[PDB]
Design a protein around this ligand. Sequence first.
Ligand SMILES: Cc1cccc(Nc2nc(N[C@@H]3CCCC[C@@H]3N)c(C#N)cc2C(N)=O)c1
Length: 372
Amino acid sequence: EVQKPLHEQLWYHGAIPRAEVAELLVHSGDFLVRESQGKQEYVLSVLWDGLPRHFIIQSLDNLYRLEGEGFPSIPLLIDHLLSTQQPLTKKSGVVLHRAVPKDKWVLNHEDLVLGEQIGRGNFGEVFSGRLRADNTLVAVKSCRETLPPDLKAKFLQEARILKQYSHPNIVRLIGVCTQKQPIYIVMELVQGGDFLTFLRTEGARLRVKTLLQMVGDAAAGMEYLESKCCIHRDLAARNCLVTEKNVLKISDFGMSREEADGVYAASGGLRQVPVKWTAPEALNYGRYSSESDVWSFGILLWETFSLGASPYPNLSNQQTREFVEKGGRLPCPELCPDAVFRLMEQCWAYEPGQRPSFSTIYQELQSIRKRH
Ligand SMILES: Cc1cccc(Nc2nc(N[C@@H]3CCCC[C@@H]3N)c(C#N)cc2C(N)=O)c1
């Protein structure tokens, strides 16, 4: 192990950002080695007095050192520090205790080939791609380096969340390329693309039964998310994906948040908030919950049965908020069955406690589908 190159070491995390570092270092003396993207030097990061401390690993005459002996590799330096229990510096008194290994989700850049751009997200372009080992087709999310540091820190949230999930109606994470820049999130490629484009393109040919089965899929995904305490926050047709067999998967988990007691209090400072898909209490008071996702699901039902019409077309975001406060809601689409529209109206109850559960939504859509 100690003879293996640095890049192969389990405790070498490469281009991991500072915020993820604090996530991974749990106990006193927990440590990892990474590359400082800014400075272009190796860094030893160690938890001490509850906070991560960062030490620049010095290099001279092909020997690596801190303030003591030099070694011809960083793994030899780390082995020395761990085995001797010598403080990293006399001044700091920091002592290594446990190497934090990479999780199973870390993917080497060499394992991936990027293809054509397929979309544009809030953080940057999304590309198609392939895993070199087996020709698995993938979708690859990128993060533009010019984004504000506070927003870039949030990029890996989608991956942290999806690491935990497995469901037929939720997009599958494949890995995260954090060993070098540029940082990527790698997911299964859902080849039929987004649901909004699907509806608009294939509209005329779609049977009501098929539409009900697809939103039924969306409801199952959301039921699963609710069971995991996940609040999605960005549910919309454009953020659902369609497989070759017309199965719908929920996608785009960048804004999603896990909350054990079911409520996420927003910072208030979110840019490009999907106002027309968002519940009043979430906009007014920053109160996001499964109940605010239910509101969004109502809008998704509307998009589905209008075959991809744009909601509140004649209104600005602010006018839409004012309209909704007055009791304004979207009209019944002509292809929408009466029963679907009654469910839709319940999803848009002004008070969050009055909206249906995702279980109820799933079961109601299923019952309607068995008529058609
Ligand atoms: C053919 C085709 C066309 C378009 C997308 C995809 N696939 C994806 N698109 C995505 N984000 C997109 C951002 C822009 C609007 C559409 C998507 N929401 C995301 C995410 N996260 C994942 C995929 C995926 N895993 O296949 C595939």
